[PDB]
């Protein structure tokens, strides 16, 4: 999922 | 001995400049060359252009636009006016570029030396200077900054990771809401954040640099500073090892956020300001706090970089323009002995070529 | 007319 | 040259  | 110099560059009152046209929406400073002004001198519209070369010899010029923003580089100001956009080289008394939008633009700024970006209710455009084009629009806002007041909107180098910035009042605090965007992913992120900036950041046994996305929040739990790699390291790369540290607000800044951040890659040093005028200085590699103050007894609203030292301008509510960079024959010895912390200090010392580590 | 008089 | 205020 995630950017971070 | 202060780890920073502190600088006072002017006082815009002193150039006839009401203190009623300081503030957001009035003044502007794209860079630290140019700082632009919208007032009324009786029915008439003007934009006075200070530069910040020649300060005391400002340029008026009638227009009737809503938003006044000068290149980074070079006198060319964009201006607007509802969905109408007009690009003018000042010097050729030239319109080099114009367009109309279909929405209202609440929030625009030069991310480049030649690239506006566009803030509309609904997306966020790029529009570069460069032979024909019109806006391309690079992603559409997330729902969590829905109702806020845009208030920042940056790049890494690369343009490749984008994130626009908003506040609004949520339980009777500030409420930072980020938008991260990758380009090459075409996703977002929502982020609860208040300032950030991107930089790059070559770690030791690695071949090419890293892009790191470092923010600043004073959330629910109280402030945090983020220090973070984006994306793939590049191929033959170690990842960055993400930071988080405290950031500090005394009991009486109980209302203060962070409002502005650069960052010195010259030093790799973070420089952040809070809204009530806090100055504070971390690592940008460990995330260590090496220094906190006060600089400004009036609210900061703008900043940029301050190129001739890897510092941080700004302008206050005054009008006073400030500007804050690493002291260079003092940071070390400053970490050393106040901080005592010798292995930032020698780390520090090697990693910019800084003077001071002789003796820990 | 233009945003800017020059 | 200047000095913070704290």
């Given at each position: 999922?995630?950017?971070? | 001995?202060l780890?920073?110099?502190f600088?006072?560059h002017?006082?815009?009152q ?18 630290d060359?140019?700082?632009?002004i919208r007032?009324?001198?009786g ?11 020649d ?7 009638p227009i ?6 000068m290149?980074p580089?070079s ?12 690009i003018?080289?000042?010097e ?7 367009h ?13 030396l030649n ?9 966020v455009?790029?529009?570069?200077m460069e ?13 969590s ?8 909107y ?10 626009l910035?908003?506040i ?12 991260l ?5 075409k ?15 070559k ?5 090419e640099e890293?892009?790191l ?14 220090i973070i ?7 033959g ?11 500090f607000?005394?009991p009486e800044?109980?209302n ?15 420089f952040l ?8 200085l ?10 906190m103050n ?10 940029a970089?301050?190129?001739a ?15 804050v960079?690493?002291?260079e ?24 070529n ?7």
């Amino acid at each position: 999922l995630p950017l971070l | 001995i202060l780890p920073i110099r502190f600088q006072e560059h002017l006082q815009l009152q002193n150039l006839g400049i009401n203190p009623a046209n300081i503030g957001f929406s009035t003044l502007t400073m794209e860079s630290d060359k140019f700082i632009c002004i919208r007032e009324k001198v009786g029915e008439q519209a003007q934009v006075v252009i200070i530069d910040m070369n020649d300060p005391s010899n400002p340029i008026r010029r009638p227009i009737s636009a809503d938003s006044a923003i000068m290149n980074p580089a070079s006198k060319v100001i964009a201006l607007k006016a509802g969905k109408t956009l007009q690009i003018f080289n000042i010097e050729m008394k030239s319109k080099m570029k114009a367009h109309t939008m279909t929405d209202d633009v609440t929030f625009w700024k030069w991310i480049s030396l030649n690239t506006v970006a566009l803030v509309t209710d609904n997306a966020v455009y790029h529009w570069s200077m460069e032979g024909e084009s019109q806006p391309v629009k690079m992603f559409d806002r997330h729902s969590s900054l829905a109702g806020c007041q845009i208030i920042n909107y940056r790049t890494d180098a690369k343009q490749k990771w984008l994130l626009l910035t908003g506040i609004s009042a949520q339980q009777n605090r500030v409420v930072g809401a980020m938008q991260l965007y990758s380009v090459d992913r075409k996703v977002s992120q929502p982020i609860e954040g208040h300032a950030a900036s991107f930089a790059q950041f070559k770690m030791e046994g690695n071949a090419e640099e890293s892009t790191l996305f470092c923010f600043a929040v004073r959330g629910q739990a109280g402030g945090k500073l983020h220090i973070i790699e984006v994306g793939t390291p590049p191929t033959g790369n170690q990842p960055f090892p993400k930071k988080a540290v405290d950031v500090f607000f005394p009991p009486e800044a109980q209302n203060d956020f962070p409002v502005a951040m650069q960052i010195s890659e010259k030093h790799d040093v973070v420089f952040l300001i809070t809204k009530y005028g806090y100055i504070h200085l971390y690592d940008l590699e460990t995330g260590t706090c090496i220094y906190m103050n006060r600089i400004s007894g009036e609210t900061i609203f703008v900043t940029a970089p301050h190129e001739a030292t890897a510092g941080i301008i700004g302008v206050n509510r005054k009008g006073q323009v400030l500007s804050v960079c690493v002291e260079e024959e003092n940071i070390i010895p400053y970490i050393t002995n106040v901080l005592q912390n010798p292995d930032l200090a020698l780390r520090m010392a090697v990693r910019n070529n800084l003077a001071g580590a002789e003796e820990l």
